[PDB]
Design a protein around this ligand. Structure first.
Ligand SMILES: Cc1ccc(NC(=O)OC[C@]23CN(S(=O)(=O)c4ccc(C(C)(C)C)cc4)C[C@H]2C[C@H]2C[C@@H]3C2(C)C)cc1
Length: 365
């Protein structure tokens, strides 16, 4: 089911980089001069929100056409800019003074760009993480030390720690995604060792991805996350503060509901759920968040579901090494989901005070 570019590498239409996976490779940092007013607001979001200046600065913008964003990277950068501006405009300082209408000079170009990219007109994982990063030194490896985000909402919102640790988890998982064609090849060729080493490589990369996930505690403070950053990742779908949604002035007449951030927007959980056949109203929210992933990445997840099952192949072999390599992959994925629930508990549930994991742990044998 996976379309191949050649005998080794999956098709470029999936937009999956060998080094950074679902992340956008070498994101664009600067827009054309034509868009300098957008870039100024987005780069000054912290001080503009703090000073109460953001909303009126947005209301003074002129209408800028999207016709000059001529390539994928420039359009993804513009989506990140307009997306951050939009979140900052709707929520403001996050105290309760919300805006239920997005001015047209942002809404129209934002919604037109989102239409081109087939993404909802709201900030999504693919914006604020997958495309929101740069290398400090191009000649040095992808490390926290050597990386930075492009945009933040409030000084001290820990957006670098939160977004970059997430990104580095995605990059660790990239080293596992590149092995997927080897898994299916080894199954058609009945190559025991090739499949075994592929599965152990995937397990090793997902375990490294968990070790990267651990870094979150060193760069994100629970209070700052729950009280500040979480605000700007919140949406207008089932939100009592925007019960009917947001009016995109000049694009739709009626308000429209779009969901805020969710860990389900990372294609990593589903990619290896499907590969390992450890797939689970929650299925309705899972599929919905799939439509918040980049379209090419949805198509990769779907092509994966059309390949033969690795679980079945492995358990029919009477092959302890293959079963233990498969189990190491599932265990790695279950541990990532456990840690996501631990982070939800420490960074949302506890500060608020003051089942996917089960389906996956069931499919171990
Ligand atoms: C817009 C937006 C903003 C951020 C995100 N983040 C996201 O999808 O992260 C994926 C994670 C889960 N988190 S998390 O810290 O548990 C985590 C916890 C909560 C959230 C929100 C605030 C959205 C509810 C987000 C993330 C870290 C990251 C690392 C590992 C585990 C998966 C991973 C890649 C496999 C999505 C939408």
């Amino acid at each position: 089911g996976i379309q191949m570019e050649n005998s080794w590498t999956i098709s470029k239409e999936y937009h999956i980089d060998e080094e950074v996976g679902f992340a956008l490779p070498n994101p664009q940092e600067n827009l054309p001069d034509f868009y300098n007013d957008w870039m100024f607001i987005a780069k000054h979001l912290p001080d503009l929100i703090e000073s109460g200046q953001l909303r009126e600065r947005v209301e003074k913008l002129n209408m800028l056409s999207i016709d000059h964003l001529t390539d994928h990277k420039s359009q993804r950068l513009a989506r990140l800019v307009l997306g951050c501006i939009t979140m900052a405009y709707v929520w403001g300082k996050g105290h309760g003074d919300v805006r239920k209408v997005l001015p047209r000079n942002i809404a129209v170009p934002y919604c037109q760009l989102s239409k081109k990219l087939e993404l909802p007109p709201i900030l999504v994982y693919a914006d604020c993480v997958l495309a929101n990063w740069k290398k400090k030194d191009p000649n040095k490896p992808l490390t926290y030390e050597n990386m930075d985000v492009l945009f933040s909402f409030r000084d001290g919102d820990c957006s670098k720690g939160f977004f970059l640790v997430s990104l580095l988890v995605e990059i660790a998982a990239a080293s596992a995604i590149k092995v997927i064609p080897t898994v299916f090849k080894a199954m058609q060729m009945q190559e025991r060792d090739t499949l075994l080493k592929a599965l152990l490589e995937i397990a090793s990369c997902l375990e490294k991805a968990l070790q990267v996930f651990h870094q979150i505690h060193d760069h994100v403070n629970p209070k700052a996350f729950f009280s500040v950053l979480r605000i700007y990742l919140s949406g207008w779908k089932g939100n009592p503060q925007l019960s009917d949604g947001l009016v995109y002035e000049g694009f739709w007449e009626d308000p429209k509901e779009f969901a805020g951030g969710s860990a389900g927007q990372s294609s990593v959980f589903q990619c290896f759920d499907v590969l390992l056949g450890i797939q689970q109203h929650a299925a309705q929210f899972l599929q919905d968040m799939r439509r918040y992933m980049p379209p090419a990445h949805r198509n990769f997840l779907c092509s994966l579901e059309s390949n033969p099952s690795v679980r079945e192949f492995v358990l029919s072999k009477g092959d302890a090494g293959l079963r233990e390599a498969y189990d190491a992959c599932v265990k790695a994925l279950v541990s990532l989901r456990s840690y996501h629930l631990q982070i939800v508990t420490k960074y949302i549930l506890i500060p608020a005070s003051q089942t996917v994991r089960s389906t996956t742990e069931k499919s171990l044998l």
